[PDB]
DNA sequence: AAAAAAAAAAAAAAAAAAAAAAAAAAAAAAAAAAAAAAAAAAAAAAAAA
């Protein structure tokens, strides 16, 4: 769906394919930067599937650009700061690949702390054994198989979901006060989810 | 005991400057020789009893 959007997956990139390389111009004097995935997805989505399979001399190069959203390569006599505003959508498998359910999600995925600690949402997805869902998935895919173009009726196009996306990233909302105070609010209520007595939440707020 | 790691650690290929090596390269002027010609001195043969 998305432009300026890249997808790769878990131990197909090296961290120069995924974040920068240098090549010196053929023609003249100066240096080309060869973009890799983080800038290819500057201003859109970079989708690393298989992200608990990524080795740690790309996983830290992913944290980078998670951290000040830029990457600083010095390489063969040039040295530059490009610019890596992306979004980050991962999938990570658990930990012998069941999600256990009676475990905290650091004790679940192999995913190292500074990583974790900025992702603004995880989502478990669990396989629970239901006879309804089984039926609703079984009916879904089944669907999908059987009427190709059709048995999709979305609401709005991709590619008015697409200049309207276009439009509405150039409006800026600022926060109210009383947006402020109901924040306030909330995050306190978050707070208190995690405090003794009641069960233990997947992971701290 | 094997199963992921996580380095050496070797190769091929690249660069990447050095620092050395390699490759290009006639025409203009002169002089000497040999030949001429020219001013001067010198050496010939016609004059007469």
Not at 9 to 14: D, E, P, V
Not at 84 to 93: D, E, G, P, V
Not at 161 to 172: E, G, H, P, S
Request: hydrophobic share 40%.
């Amino acid at each position: 769906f998305s432009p300026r959007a890249v997808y790769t997956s878990g131990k197909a990139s090296s961290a120069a394919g995924l974040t920068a390389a240098v090549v010196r111009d053929e023609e003249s004097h100066e240096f080309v930067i060869e973009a890799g995935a983080l800038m290819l997805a500057d201003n859109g989505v970079c989708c690393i599937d298989e992200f608990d399979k990524m080795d740690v001399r790309d996983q830290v190069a992913i944290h980078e650009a998670m951290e000040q959203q830029t990457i600083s390569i010095t390489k063969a006599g040039v040295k530059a700061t490009l610019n890596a505003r992306t979004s980050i959508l991962a999938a990570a498998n658990p930990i012998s690949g069941h999600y256990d359910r009676s475990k905290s999600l650091k004790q679940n995925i192999n995913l190292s702390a500074p990583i974790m600690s900025r992702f603004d949402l995880f989502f478990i997805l669990v396989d629970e054994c239901n006879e309804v869902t089984d039926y609703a998935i079984a009916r879904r895919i089944v669907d999908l198989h059987s009427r190709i173009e059709e048995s999709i009726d979305r609401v709005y196009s991709l590619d008015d979901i697409r200049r309207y996306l276009l439009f509405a990233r150039q409006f800026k909302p600022k926060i109210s006060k009383e947006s402020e105070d109901f924040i306030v609010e909330q995050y306190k209520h978050l707070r208190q989810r995690d405090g003794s007595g009641v069960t233990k939440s997947s992971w701290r707020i």
